[PDB]
Design a protein around this ligand. Sequence first.
Ligand SMILES: [Ca+2]
Ligand SMILES: [Ca+2]
Ligand SMILES: [Ca+2]
Ligand SMILES: [Ca+2]
Lengths: 96, 77, 143, 145
Amino acid sequence: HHHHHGSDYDDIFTTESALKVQQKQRQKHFNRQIPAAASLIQTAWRCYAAENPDSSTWKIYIEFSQLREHHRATIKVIRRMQYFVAKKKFQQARKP
Amino acid sequence: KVQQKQRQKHFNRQIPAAASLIQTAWRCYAAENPDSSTWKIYIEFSQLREHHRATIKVIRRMQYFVAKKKFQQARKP
Amino acid sequence: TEEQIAEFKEAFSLFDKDGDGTITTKELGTVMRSLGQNPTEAELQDMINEVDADGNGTIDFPEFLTMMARKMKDTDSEEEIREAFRVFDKDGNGYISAAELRHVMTNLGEKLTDEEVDEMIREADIDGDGQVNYEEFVQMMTA
Amino acid sequence: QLTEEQIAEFKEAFSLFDKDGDGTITTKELGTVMRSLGQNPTEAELQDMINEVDADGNGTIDFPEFLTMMARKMKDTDSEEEIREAFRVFDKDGNGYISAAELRHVMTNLGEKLTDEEVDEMIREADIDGDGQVNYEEFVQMMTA
Ligand SMILES: [Ca+2]
Ligand SMILES: [Ca+2]
Ligand SMILES: [Ca+2]
Ligand SMILES: [Ca+2]
Protein backbone atom coordinates (compact mmCIF):
# COMPACT_ATOMS: atom_id res chain seq x y z
CA HIS A 1 0.00 0.00 0.00
CA HIS A 2 2.58 2.55 -1.18
CA HIS A 3 3.59 4.32 -4.40
CA HIS A 4 6.71 6.01 -5.80
CA HIS A 5 8.04 6.77 -9.30
CA GLY A 6 10.01 3.77 -10.58
CA SER A 7 11.37 5.08 -13.91
CA ASP A 8 12.02 1.89 -15.94
CA TYR A 9 11.88 2.01 -19.73
CA ASP A 10 12.17 -1.53 -21.14
CA ASP A 11 8.98 -3.56 -21.62
CA ILE A 12 8.39 -7.33 -21.52
CA PHE A 13 4.63 -7.11 -22.08
CA THR A 14 4.56 -8.70 -25.58
CA THR A 15 1.41 -6.58 -26.05
CA GLU A 16 0.25 -4.87 -29.22
CA SER A 17 -5.72 -8.77 -32.91
CA ALA A 18 -8.01 -5.99 -31.68
CA LEU A 19 -7.15 -3.54 -34.46
CA LYS A 20 -8.88 -4.89 -37.57
CA VAL A 21 -11.27 -6.94 -35.42
CA GLN A 22 -12.63 -3.83 -33.73
CA GLN A 23 -13.69 -3.10 -37.29
CA LYS A 24 -16.36 -5.78 -36.84
CA GLN A 25 -17.85 -3.69 -34.02
CA ARG A 26 -18.37 -0.73 -36.35
CA GLN A 27 -19.85 -2.91 -39.08
CA LYS A 28 -22.39 -4.43 -36.73
CA HIS A 29 -23.08 -0.80 -35.82
CA PHE A 30 -23.78 0.31 -39.36
CA ASN A 31 -25.74 -2.91 -39.93
CA ARG A 32 -28.12 -1.71 -37.23
CA GLN A 33 -28.63 1.58 -39.07
CA ILE A 34 -30.05 0.10 -42.26
CA PRO A 35 -33.31 -1.29 -40.77
CA ALA A 36 -33.65 1.83 -38.62
CA ALA A 37 -33.24 4.26 -41.53
CA ALA A 38 -35.65 2.35 -43.75
CA SER A 39 -38.26 2.37 -40.98
CA LEU A 40 -37.91 6.10 -40.42
CA ILE A 41 -38.58 6.84 -44.11
CA GLN A 42 -41.52 4.43 -44.23
CA THR A 43 -43.17 5.68 -41.05
CA ALA A 44 -42.68 9.30 -42.05
CA TRP A 45 -44.26 8.81 -45.46
CA ARG A 46 -47.15 6.74 -44.08
CA CYS A 47 -47.90 9.70 -41.85
CA TYR A 48 -47.81 11.98 -44.91
CA ALA A 49 -50.00 9.73 -47.06
CA ALA A 50 -52.50 9.19 -44.23
CA GLU A 51 -53.54 12.85 -44.34
CA ASN A 52 -54.64 12.23 -47.92
CA PRO A 53 -58.07 10.54 -47.54
CA ASP A 54 -58.22 8.91 -51.01
CA SER A 55 -54.56 8.23 -51.76
CA SER A 56 -54.49 4.47 -51.31
CA THR A 57 -52.35 3.54 -48.38
CA TRP A 58 -55.81 2.62 -47.12
CA LYS A 59 -55.95 -0.35 -49.49
CA ILE A 60 -53.37 -2.04 -47.24
CA TYR A 61 -56.33 -2.66 -44.94
CA ILE A 62 -58.08 -5.56 -46.68
CA GLU A 63 -61.19 -6.07 -44.54
CA PHE A 64 -62.22 -2.40 -44.77
CA SER A 65 -61.57 -1.89 -48.46
CA GLN A 66 -63.63 -5.07 -48.71
CA LEU A 67 -66.27 -3.48 -46.52
CA ARG A 68 -66.30 -0.27 -48.57
CA GLU A 69 -66.50 -2.18 -51.87
CA HIS A 70 -69.45 -4.13 -50.45
CA HIS A 71 -70.98 -0.92 -49.09
CA ARG A 72 -70.85 0.91 -52.43
CA ALA A 73 -72.04 -2.20 -54.29
CA THR A 74 -75.23 -2.49 -52.22
CA ILE A 75 -75.97 1.24 -52.66
CA LYS A 76 -75.54 1.24 -56.47
CA VAL A 77 -77.91 -1.73 -56.85
CA ILE A 78 -80.52 -0.19 -54.57
CA ARG A 79 -80.30 3.18 -56.29
CA ARG A 80 -80.85 1.60 -59.69
CA MET A 81 -83.97 -0.21 -58.45
CA GLN A 82 -85.29 3.06 -57.07
CA TYR A 83 -84.57 4.62 -60.47
CA PHE A 84 -86.55 2.07 -62.46
CA VAL A 85 -89.43 2.37 -60.01
CA ALA A 86 -89.30 6.17 -60.32
CA LYS A 87 -89.08 5.70 -64.06
CA LYS A 88 -92.23 3.57 -64.42
CA LYS A 89 -94.25 5.58 -61.90
CA PHE A 90 -93.55 8.73 -63.91
CA GLN A 91 -94.99 7.47 -67.18
CA GLN A 92 -98.00 6.27 -65.18
CA ALA A 93 -98.39 9.83 -63.94
CA ARG A 94 -98.32 11.30 -67.44
CA LYS A 95 -100.59 8.99 -69.47
CA PRO A 96 -104.09 10.58 -69.43
CA LYS B 1 -115.19 22.06 -68.21
CA VAL B 2 -115.76 20.98 -64.60
CA GLN B 3 -113.71 17.82 -65.24
CA GLN B 4 -110.64 20.03 -64.68
CA LYS B 5 -110.38 18.85 -61.07
CA GLN B 6 -109.61 15.41 -62.51
CA ARG B 7 -107.14 16.88 -64.99
CA GLN B 8 -105.42 18.95 -62.29
CA LYS B 9 -105.29 16.16 -59.71
CA HIS B 10 -103.77 14.18 -62.57
CA PHE B 11 -101.05 16.82 -62.83
CA ASN B 12 -100.82 16.94 -59.04
CA ARG B 13 -99.49 13.40 -59.08
CA GLN B 14 -96.95 14.30 -61.76
CA ILE B 15 -94.98 16.70 -59.58
CA PRO B 16 -93.79 14.10 -57.01
CA ALA B 17 -93.12 11.68 -59.84
CA ALA B 18 -90.99 14.14 -61.85
CA ALA B 19 -89.02 15.20 -58.77
CA SER B 20 -88.26 11.56 -57.90
CA LEU B 21 -87.13 10.74 -61.44
CA ILE B 22 -84.60 13.58 -61.31
CA GLN B 23 -83.43 12.59 -57.85
CA THR B 24 -83.11 8.88 -58.58
CA ALA B 25 -81.29 9.59 -61.84
CA TRP B 26 -78.77 11.93 -60.25
CA ARG B 27 -78.14 9.64 -57.27
CA CYS B 28 -77.15 6.98 -59.82
CA TYR B 29 -74.87 9.55 -61.45
CA ALA B 30 -73.38 10.65 -58.10
CA ALA B 31 -72.87 7.03 -57.03
CA GLU B 32 -70.38 6.19 -59.80
CA ASN B 33 -68.12 8.85 -58.34
CA PRO B 34 -66.54 7.35 -55.18
CA ASP B 35 -65.36 10.49 -53.35
CA SER B 36 -67.82 13.12 -54.48
CA SER B 37 -70.08 12.14 -51.62
CA THR B 38 -73.69 11.33 -51.80
CA TRP B 39 -72.17 8.74 -49.41
CA LYS B 40 -72.17 11.20 -46.54
CA ILE B 41 -75.94 10.59 -46.31
CA TYR B 42 -75.05 7.21 -44.76
CA ILE B 43 -74.25 8.35 -41.23
CA GLU B 44 -73.02 5.30 -39.38
CA PHE B 45 -70.73 4.20 -42.22
CA SER B 46 -69.27 7.68 -42.68
CA GLN B 47 -68.63 7.69 -38.94
CA LEU B 48 -67.12 4.21 -39.26
CA ARG B 49 -64.73 5.62 -41.87
CA GLU B 50 -63.72 8.64 -39.77
CA HIS B 51 -63.22 6.31 -36.79
CA HIS B 52 -61.12 4.05 -38.99
CA ARG B 53 -58.84 6.82 -40.33
CA ALA B 54 -58.52 8.35 -36.85
CA THR B 55 -57.23 5.09 -35.39
CA ILE B 56 -54.70 4.71 -38.21
CA LYS B 57 -53.34 8.26 -38.06
CA VAL B 58 -52.68 7.87 -34.33
CA ILE B 59 -51.12 4.43 -34.69
CA ARG B 60 -49.01 5.46 -37.66
CA ARG B 61 -47.35 8.27 -35.69
CA MET B 62 -46.65 6.24 -32.57
CA GLN B 63 -44.75 4.05 -35.02
CA TYR B 64 -43.03 7.17 -36.36
CA PHE B 65 -41.79 8.33 -32.99
CA VAL B 66 -40.59 4.80 -32.23
CA ALA B 67 -38.79 4.72 -35.59
CA LYS B 68 -37.49 8.20 -34.78
CA LYS B 69 -35.90 7.23 -31.43
CA LYS B 70 -34.57 3.89 -32.67
CA PHE B 71 -32.76 5.68 -35.48
CA GLN B 72 -31.12 8.14 -33.08
CA GLN B 73 -29.71 5.24 -31.10
CA ALA B 74 -28.50 3.54 -34.29
CA ARG B 75 -26.62 6.71 -35.21
CA LYS B 76 -25.05 7.27 -31.78
CA PRO B 77 -21.66 5.50 -31.31
CA THR C 1 -67.26 -9.63 -69.78
CA GLU C 2 -65.20 -11.37 -67.14
CA GLU C 3 -64.70 -8.56 -64.61
CA GLN C 4 -68.29 -7.65 -64.03
CA ILE C 5 -70.03 -11.03 -64.02
CA ALA C 6 -67.94 -11.89 -60.96
CA GLU C 7 -68.81 -8.47 -59.58
CA PHE C 8 -72.55 -9.05 -60.06
CA LYS C 9 -72.32 -12.52 -58.50
CA GLU C 10 -70.80 -10.95 -55.38
CA ALA C 11 -73.38 -8.14 -55.28
CA PHE C 12 -76.22 -10.68 -55.53
CA SER C 13 -74.81 -12.59 -52.55
CA LEU C 14 -74.82 -9.35 -50.54
CA PHE C 15 -78.61 -9.30 -50.65
CA ASP C 16 -79.01 -13.09 -50.43
CA LYS C 17 -77.63 -14.12 -47.04
CA ASP C 18 -79.64 -17.28 -47.63
CA GLY C 19 -77.39 -18.77 -50.33
CA ASP C 20 -80.56 -20.22 -51.84
CA GLY C 21 -80.29 -18.00 -54.92
CA THR C 22 -83.34 -15.88 -54.14
CA ILE C 23 -83.95 -12.34 -52.87
CA THR C 24 -87.09 -11.73 -50.79
CA THR C 25 -88.56 -8.47 -49.52
CA LYS C 26 -87.29 -9.03 -45.98
CA GLU C 27 -83.84 -9.64 -47.44
CA LEU C 28 -83.95 -6.33 -49.31
CA GLY C 29 -85.59 -4.56 -46.37
CA THR C 30 -82.78 -5.73 -44.10
CA VAL C 31 -80.05 -4.31 -46.33
CA MET C 32 -81.77 -0.93 -46.56
CA ARG C 33 -82.48 -0.88 -42.82
CA SER C 34 -78.85 -1.72 -42.11
CA LEU C 35 -77.89 1.35 -44.18
CA GLY C 36 -79.99 3.54 -41.88
CA GLN C 37 -83.04 3.73 -44.12
CA ASN C 38 -86.65 3.03 -43.18
CA PRO C 39 -88.56 1.63 -46.19
CA THR C 40 -92.06 0.12 -46.14
CA GLU C 41 -93.53 -3.13 -47.45
CA ALA C 42 -95.16 -1.27 -50.38
CA GLU C 43 -91.90 0.34 -51.56
CA LEU C 44 -90.06 -2.97 -51.26
CA GLN C 45 -92.88 -4.66 -53.17
CA ASP C 46 -92.54 -2.03 -55.90
CA MET C 47 -88.76 -2.37 -56.04
CA ILE C 48 -89.00 -6.14 -56.36
CA ASN C 49 -91.95 -6.13 -58.79
CA GLU C 50 -89.89 -3.96 -61.15
CA VAL C 51 -87.07 -6.48 -61.12
CA ASP C 52 -88.89 -9.83 -60.82
CA ALA C 53 -90.11 -10.75 -64.28
CA ASP C 54 -91.67 -14.16 -63.66
CA GLY C 55 -94.09 -13.02 -60.95
CA ASN C 56 -92.96 -15.34 -58.15
CA GLY C 57 -92.44 -12.45 -55.75
CA THR C 58 -88.67 -12.82 -55.55
CA ILE C 59 -85.55 -12.17 -57.64
CA ASP C 60 -83.15 -14.78 -59.04
CA PHE C 61 -79.68 -14.19 -60.46
CA PRO C 62 -80.71 -14.07 -64.14
CA GLU C 63 -83.44 -11.53 -63.24
CA PHE C 64 -80.80 -9.58 -61.28
CA LEU C 65 -78.42 -9.52 -64.27
CA THR C 66 -81.13 -8.23 -66.61
CA MET C 67 -81.65 -5.12 -64.48
CA MET C 68 -77.92 -4.49 -64.17
CA ALA C 69 -77.49 -4.91 -67.91
CA ARG C 70 -80.54 -2.71 -68.50
CA LYS C 71 -79.98 0.50 -70.48
CA MET C 72 -80.01 3.86 -68.70
CA LYS C 73 -77.96 6.17 -70.91
CA ASP C 74 -80.37 5.72 -73.75
CA THR C 75 -81.94 7.72 -76.61
CA ASP C 76 -85.41 7.43 -75.03
CA SER C 77 -84.90 7.99 -71.30
CA GLU C 78 -82.91 11.22 -71.28
CA GLU C 79 -86.04 12.52 -72.98
CA GLU C 80 -87.99 10.91 -70.13
CA ILE C 81 -85.86 12.93 -67.70
CA ARG C 82 -85.96 16.15 -69.74
CA GLU C 83 -89.76 16.34 -69.64
CA ALA C 84 -89.71 15.73 -65.90
CA PHE C 85 -87.72 18.95 -65.86
CA ARG C 86 -90.35 20.48 -68.14
CA VAL C 87 -92.95 19.92 -65.41
CA PHE C 88 -91.34 22.47 -63.10
CA ASP C 89 -90.50 24.94 -65.90
CA LYS C 90 -93.37 27.43 -66.34
CA ASP C 91 -91.96 29.96 -68.82
CA GLY C 92 -91.60 27.51 -71.73
CA ASN C 93 -87.94 27.73 -72.77
CA GLY C 94 -84.96 25.83 -71.38
CA TYR C 95 -83.94 27.37 -68.04
CA ILE C 96 -85.08 26.42 -64.54
CA SER C 97 -84.31 28.80 -61.69
CA ALA C 98 -81.27 27.94 -59.57
CA ALA C 99 -83.23 28.63 -56.38
CA GLU C 100 -86.18 26.65 -57.70
CA LEU C 101 -83.99 23.59 -58.28
CA ARG C 102 -82.80 23.51 -54.66
CA HIS C 103 -86.41 23.79 -53.50
CA VAL C 104 -87.76 20.84 -55.50
CA MET C 105 -84.65 18.68 -55.00
CA THR C 106 -84.60 19.11 -51.21
CA ASN C 107 -88.33 19.36 -50.42
CA LEU C 108 -90.00 16.90 -52.82
CA GLY C 109 -89.94 13.17 -53.63
CA GLU C 110 -86.90 11.38 -52.24
CA LYS C 111 -85.82 14.74 -50.91
CA LEU C 112 -82.05 15.31 -51.09
CA THR C 113 -79.41 16.80 -48.82
CA ASP C 114 -78.21 20.37 -49.32
CA GLU C 115 -74.67 19.05 -49.80
CA GLU C 116 -75.99 16.81 -52.59
CA VAL C 117 -77.65 19.70 -54.44
CA ASP C 118 -74.52 21.75 -53.91
CA GLU C 119 -72.84 19.04 -55.96
CA MET C 120 -75.55 19.49 -58.60
CA ILE C 121 -75.17 23.27 -58.56
CA ARG C 122 -71.37 23.23 -58.84
CA GLU C 123 -71.72 20.54 -61.45
CA ALA C 124 -73.86 23.28 -62.97
CA ASP C 125 -71.63 26.29 -63.55
CA ILE C 126 -74.54 28.01 -65.31
CA ASP C 127 -75.99 31.37 -64.24
CA GLY C 128 -77.55 34.17 -66.25
CA ASP C 129 -77.67 35.57 -62.76
CA GLY C 130 -78.89 32.43 -61.09
CA GLN C 131 -80.30 30.04 -63.64
CA VAL C 132 -79.63 26.48 -64.68
CA ASN C 133 -80.22 25.14 -68.20
CA TYR C 134 -81.49 21.61 -67.68
CA GLU C 135 -80.82 19.83 -70.98
CA GLU C 136 -77.11 20.28 -70.36
CA PHE C 137 -77.66 18.44 -67.06
CA VAL C 138 -79.48 15.48 -68.55
CA GLN C 139 -76.68 15.09 -71.10
CA MET C 140 -74.25 15.17 -68.18
CA MET C 141 -76.12 12.35 -66.52
CA THR C 142 -76.18 10.70 -69.98
CA ALA C 143 -72.75 10.16 -71.47
CA GLN D 1 -51.76 25.37 -33.44
CA LEU D 2 -54.91 24.82 -31.38
CA THR D 3 -58.56 25.33 -32.22
CA GLU D 4 -61.99 24.38 -30.85
CA GLU D 5 -62.74 20.94 -32.29
CA GLN D 6 -59.12 19.94 -32.70
CA ILE D 7 -59.66 19.12 -29.06
CA ALA D 8 -63.01 17.36 -29.51
CA GLU D 9 -61.31 15.47 -32.33
CA PHE D 10 -58.64 14.02 -30.05
CA LYS D 11 -61.14 13.29 -27.27
CA GLU D 12 -63.00 10.95 -29.60
CA ALA D 13 -59.74 9.42 -30.88
CA PHE D 14 -58.69 8.63 -27.32
CA SER D 15 -62.01 6.90 -26.72
CA LEU D 16 -61.46 4.66 -29.75
CA PHE D 17 -58.46 3.02 -28.07
CA ASP D 18 -60.00 3.18 -24.60
CA LYS D 19 -63.10 0.96 -24.72
CA ASP D 20 -62.69 1.03 -20.95
CA GLY D 21 -63.98 4.53 -20.24
CA ASP D 22 -61.40 4.56 -17.45
CA GLY D 23 -59.20 7.13 -19.19
CA THR D 24 -56.45 4.56 -19.68
CA ILE D 25 -54.89 2.94 -22.74
CA THR D 26 -53.16 -0.38 -22.04
CA THR D 27 -51.15 -2.62 -24.36
CA LYS D 28 -54.15 -4.95 -24.65
CA GLU D 29 -56.23 -1.88 -25.50
CA LEU D 30 -53.72 -0.88 -28.19
CA GLY D 31 -52.98 -4.42 -29.32
CA THR D 32 -56.66 -5.05 -29.95
CA VAL D 33 -57.07 -2.00 -32.19
CA MET D 34 -54.10 -2.99 -34.36
CA ARG D 35 -55.20 -6.64 -34.30
CA SER D 36 -58.77 -5.53 -34.96
CA LEU D 37 -57.81 -4.36 -38.42
CA GLY D 38 -55.64 -5.74 -39.37
CA GLN D 39 -51.98 -6.40 -38.67
CA ASN D 40 -50.14 -8.76 -36.29
CA PRO D 41 -48.13 -6.85 -33.66
CA THR D 42 -46.33 -9.06 -31.14
CA GLU D 43 -46.67 -8.45 -27.40
CA ALA D 44 -43.45 -6.49 -27.91
CA GLU D 45 -43.59 -3.47 -30.28
CA LEU D 46 -46.62 -2.39 -28.22
CA GLN D 47 -44.66 -1.49 -25.07
CA ASP D 48 -42.24 0.44 -27.25
CA MET D 49 -45.13 2.30 -28.80
CA ILE D 50 -46.62 3.00 -25.37
CA ASN D 51 -43.29 3.80 -23.65
CA GLU D 52 -42.68 6.47 -26.30
CA VAL D 53 -46.04 8.06 -25.40
CA ASP D 54 -46.29 7.32 -21.68
CA ALA D 55 -44.28 9.98 -19.89
CA ASP D 56 -44.89 9.16 -16.22
CA GLY D 57 -43.82 5.54 -16.61
CA ASN D 58 -46.89 3.80 -15.23
CA GLY D 59 -47.10 1.59 -18.30
CA THR D 60 -50.24 3.17 -19.73
CA ILE D 61 -51.43 6.33 -21.48
CA ASP D 62 -53.91 8.91 -20.17
CA PHE D 63 -55.47 11.76 -22.20
CA PRO D 64 -52.91 14.48 -21.38
CA GLU D 65 -50.09 12.11 -22.40
CA PHE D 66 -52.12 11.43 -25.56
CA LEU D 67 -52.40 15.17 -26.19
CA THR D 68 -48.68 15.72 -25.68
CA MET D 69 -47.94 13.29 -28.50
CA MET D 70 -50.10 15.11 -31.09
CA ALA D 71 -48.98 18.47 -29.77
CA ARG D 72 -45.61 17.10 -30.85
CA LYS D 73 -44.98 17.70 -34.60
CA MET D 74 -42.95 16.72 -37.72
CA LYS D 75 -42.75 19.65 -40.11
CA ASP D 76 -42.56 22.49 -37.60
CA THR D 77 -39.23 21.14 -36.37
CA ASP D 78 -35.83 19.87 -37.29
CA SER D 79 -36.13 16.14 -37.98
CA GLU D 80 -36.31 16.99 -41.61
CA GLU D 81 -32.55 16.61 -41.15
CA GLU D 82 -33.07 13.36 -39.26
CA ILE D 83 -34.98 11.92 -42.20
CA ARG D 84 -32.35 13.34 -44.53
CA GLU D 85 -29.48 11.47 -42.88
CA ALA D 86 -31.59 8.32 -42.96
CA PHE D 87 -31.60 8.80 -46.72
CA ARG D 88 -27.83 9.37 -46.75
CA VAL D 89 -27.40 5.83 -45.42
CA PHE D 90 -28.51 4.39 -48.75
CA ASP D 91 -26.92 6.99 -51.04
CA LYS D 92 -23.47 5.58 -51.83
CA ASP D 93 -22.29 8.05 -54.48
CA GLY D 94 -22.48 11.10 -52.23
CA ASN D 95 -24.65 12.99 -54.70
CA GLY D 96 -28.08 14.07 -53.50
CA TYR D 97 -29.67 11.38 -55.65
CA ILE D 98 -30.73 7.85 -54.82
CA SER D 99 -31.54 5.38 -57.60
CA ALA D 100 -35.23 5.00 -58.45
CA ALA D 101 -34.94 1.20 -58.47
CA GLU D 102 -32.99 1.27 -55.22
CA LEU D 103 -35.79 3.20 -53.52
CA ARG D 104 -38.22 0.52 -54.72
CA HIS D 105 -36.11 -2.09 -52.97
CA VAL D 106 -35.60 -0.40 -49.60
CA MET D 107 -39.22 0.69 -49.31
CA THR D 108 -40.62 -2.75 -50.14
CA ASN D 109 -38.03 -5.19 -48.80
CA LEU D 110 -36.81 -3.54 -45.57
CA GLY D 111 -38.21 -2.34 -42.25
CA GLU D 112 -41.99 -1.98 -42.21
CA LYS D 113 -42.24 -3.14 -45.85
CA LEU D 114 -44.43 -0.74 -47.88
CA THR D 115 -46.65 -2.13 -50.64
CA ASP D 116 -45.99 -1.87 -54.39
CA GLU D 117 -48.86 0.56 -54.87
CA GLU D 118 -47.62 2.71 -51.99
CA VAL D 119 -44.17 3.23 -53.53
CA ASP D 120 -45.85 3.96 -56.85
CA GLU D 121 -47.39 6.93 -55.04
CA MET D 122 -43.93 7.88 -53.79
CA ILE D 123 -42.63 7.56 -57.36
CA ARG D 124 -45.41 9.57 -58.99
CA GLU D 125 -45.10 12.21 -56.29
CA ALA D 126 -41.45 12.11 -57.33
CA ASP D 127 -41.59 13.50 -60.87
CA ILE D 128 -37.80 13.25 -60.96
CA ASP D 129 -35.73 11.26 -63.47
CA GLY D 130 -32.48 11.68 -65.38
CA ASP D 131 -31.73 8.01 -65.37
CA GLY D 132 -34.35 8.08 -62.79
CA GLN D 133 -33.12 10.48 -60.13
CA VAL D 134 -35.22 11.07 -57.04
CA ASN D 135 -33.42 13.86 -55.22
CA TYR D 136 -34.29 12.82 -51.67
CA GLU D 137 -33.98 16.44 -50.50
CA GLU D 138 -37.21 17.39 -52.23
CA PHE D 139 -38.95 14.27 -50.83
CA VAL D 140 -37.97 15.41 -47.35
CA GLN D 141 -39.50 18.87 -47.72
CA MET D 142 -42.50 17.33 -49.44
CA MET D 143 -43.27 15.40 -46.28
CA THR D 144 -42.52 18.54 -44.26
CA ALA D 145 -44.55 21.64 -45.15
CA1 LIG E 1 -83.15 -16.19 -50.60
CA1 LIG F 1 -88.21 -14.81 -59.54
CA1 LIG G 1 -58.67 1.46 -20.27
CA1 LIG H 1 -49.15 7.36 -18.11
